[model samples]
Target chain A: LKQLDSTYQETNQQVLKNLDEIFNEMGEEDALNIKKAAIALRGDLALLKANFEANELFFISEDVIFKTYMSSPELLLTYMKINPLDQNTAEQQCGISDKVLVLYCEGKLKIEQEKQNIRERLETSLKAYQSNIGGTASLITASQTLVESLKNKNFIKGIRKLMLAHNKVFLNYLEELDALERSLEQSKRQYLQERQSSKIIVKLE
Target chain B: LKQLDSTYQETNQQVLKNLDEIFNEMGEEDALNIKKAAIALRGDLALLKANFEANELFFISEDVIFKTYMSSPELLLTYMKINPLDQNTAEQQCGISDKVLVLYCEGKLKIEQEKQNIRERLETSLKAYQSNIGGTASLITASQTLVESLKNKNFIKGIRKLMLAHNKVFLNYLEELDALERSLEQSKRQYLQERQSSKIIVKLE
Candidate 1:
């Protein structure tokens, strides 16, 4: 999840950078390059939106997983002594932490895979947009239309607003995850303490 | 936008309340009713998620509209000397503010209409869930499953977390709208101030 989140952060930075370049190029009266950059920037915006959606889904999915485990505490602590992920490789390795580890590993992989599917489609669409930016007539018309949109002060402000909003929530979400982890660790400690009283006493009678 | 935001706020409250009731009823050992409530609460959650998505689209649409106006400031300020929304039967109504008024008026109407469509679908879905609460076998199975989910402490915490996250951004969004309004008003004042110097001067010709 953090990796995907970093991807989101990277995309956001790239979007802002693209916006800066477009504006900077506009200041220099570079219509041809500004149109190209704006077209590319539009793709970055799409990716940013998709990444936000993916982040949302990740939280929802994590919530569901947390609920599933909480509904059955035994399942949360039960180690898969026989590893399903790997066919009982070298050692007879089993531990309580393995359950949560596998839970996150599998969950992150699934969500990442799904988000990647969306990234591919948007990347393809962006390529199509980029491929069309080279013609002379296209340059004039595109420059006229596209650069006009880019020139909109609100467009720039609106773009910045979206990023800032996402960053606020993105940081909050990281905090939320920290809280979740702390609580979960407390649960594990408390459960282990309680379980300690159930230690076996062999009666040879 | 504010109206739709209130709807989101309302739904969030309902979801949290439903959660509280479910947990409260669980405490009282109300098995049959707990299942029924959980089914309904799940629907509320569905609405909450949908409302969030709608809120996002509203921002995106508003951004696009802002950009459109900014790209063409004259178009933004030019009042429809005669209202196409109404007919010429009305008084000769013309004002610069009318342009922004129409912009928001039409924009709000369109977004509200779209959100209403999703609300109806979810409401229908909730009704379907409510209608299925009478069977003994279903009750035992759903109570076994649904109530277990509601019983999950993490589930409750997770639900609360989602709402808190949304509220943080929701309030921020309100502030953003306030800022947007303030800036737009400033633009109007500056433009009018500049226009003042161009006022008609009778040279006594």
Candidate 2:
């Protein structure tokens, strides 16, 4: 868990550099706009990452108060740096997080849509322009193949993927936090009530 | 002749620089190959310039012969820095000077064809991607207009225009070279024949 969480830092920086390169290379306006979409998704991923880490810290503090809880400072520090809970990006929007995620995911969809749009036109365009040029079909294939090659690597860590991976861990932690807090509070209350009764019993004896 | 000829050199350099900028910006493979074609056209322009200049020097020396008329030792020297006629470049190919011009024209044609190819793909791919994008028509317009904006100021002197302009002067010069040579030789022979006649008359007296 510790190692995987650390990997996001590495992935985040490398992924951003690659994205900038890809964005810089594009000439067409449509492609640039789609790049805008991909860019937004990446930004969302960064926020989600921070949110997950802060949520993890929230769990740590609760755990320490209950039972004989122990926590690692280094671990806490790493997650804490993310500062996820400083704002429930969700709360300010009146629980608009779901809407935001939907839109965020759409940004990625638009990129795929953009790529598909390019492929179909290129396929037919090879034919349309064939009277003028030969081997365009091969050229089309060459272009698309490279797109596919980078597709998995570039946007694969894309928003939806990041969020989906995130959803499982984050949701579990939040749910577990709630259950643990309830159980811990109940036990403390019961202990205090019993102690009061025992003191009275000792006096009566 | 001087002004028109100089323009080709200017056009050649500017067009290549613009092409390089365009190529650097592209990530797709098909776009890259169009860039390659444009690049080859650039190389071809350079070669054709050498070939054209060589042909021009051939005319100058012949001009200097018929009269004391000629570029100065210093003047033709600067022009001769070009050293135009060390080679006909095609005599080995069965007197192929005419054939060389044909290939030369094709280079210009290819460049226009290459530029148009780039434009078409950008336009249609814009269309295909349109379901997800808007104002593409304007981007297409924006890009084309820039091609025009720079066109006159930049490539108007371009090889295409250069060749068309030079085609007339260059063709006339070469064809006239043969005619001028024949006429000059005829006039010299007549003068020698008259001188011999006077000598015979003096001997008879």
Candidate 3:
């Protein structure tokens, strides 16, 4: 988006310059025509710039908190565990602050995406548990004969089935939490890697 | 602990001063006796100081991460959202930095204690679920006649009991998560209040 905006700006400037040159060399009527064309072009470009800015604002709003947190150089440095001296040297090489902020944004984005994924998975897991239990209830009440044969082997099987199902439900929930914890660990590492390799804005005292 | 250490040091100083005065005024024999007593007292005080320091270390180690995070004034200020200007003025008012750090520690300590309590409650809840489920299974298989009469009204009752139990279990788990979320919200607010009311160490640019 930044590149696109920059390129659009460059094109606008060059187009205006060419129009100015054409106006300067033309006859009175041609000069007027060129002037009108330049005015129209400038108007269109202004609208384009406005649209570009709106898009940027929309993008920023999507992750407002993440952007706000990244706005602080010192906070970023503390979070990233970066030294001012190292950042100073690296600034020229990679625009340290920008790079670090970019990476931080990327890492935060990944986490946000993962959270959404985790929510979906949790919903699915919960539904499965609910449905299975529901199914067990329905199975027990499926027929009057089945309901009356409380001492039948089938009833014992149903009991055993539910016991095992309950066990699995608990285990699966635990597994989900474990997976989440592990994912968080990986995300932290990934964030650290990004921050360590890049940098952020801050000057030493 | 700091106050105790300072008081202990003050006592040691006063004791040594008195001993010096005694040595200066006393005869050779008396001076020798006073000297030996002063040496013994100094040794005892040294041991007491060592023990005091060890206790202090142990206390700090209990919440090492909280201490480490609070160690950096910049991080604390960032975390607490304290402005350097306000901090400067408040420094003399109530030793702003120390007060803020104290509050931060209090908040973190509260969080840690809450976590332990939550863990205990979770364990209890889990145990109840397990035992309830176990009891239901046992009731199902208690008698051969019961097992054989799987279609009996008794078996249907068992099924209904388990269905209700499973629903309650799920609802209870959901309640736990909701309660935890609420607790965390309160903890965060408590932390913010503490930080906003207090201060921390850091000089502005």
User: What's the lDDT of the predicted structure labeled candidate 2?
Assistant: 0.39
iRMSD value for model 3: 38.6
Decide which is better by lDDT, 1 or 2.
1
Write down the RMSD of all candidates, one decimal each: 46.6, 53.7, 48.6
Could you give the DockQ of candidate 2? 0.00
CAPRI accuracy category, model 2: incorrect
Ranking by DockQ: 3, 1, 2
Which runs of model 3 end up more than 4 angstroms from their true locations? A1-151, A200-205, B1-205
Best by DockQ: 3
| Model 3, span A75-177: residue lDDT tens | 4344444423344434443353445444343333333443454355445434544444343333323322222233234433443343344344334434543
Q: In candidate 2, how many clashes are counted?
A: 3
State each candidate's chain A TM-score. Answer: 0.30, 0.30, 0.28
Candidate 3 is graded, for docking, as incorrect
What TM-score does chain B of candidate 3 reach? 0.27
**DockQ for each numbered candidate:** 0.01, 0.00, 0.02
Error of model 3, residue A96, in angstroms: 99
Worst 10 residues of 3 chain B by lDDT: B139-148
For candidate 1, write residues B100-184 as lDDT tens digits: 4443343333333434544554454344424432232232234334323333333223323433453343344334334433443
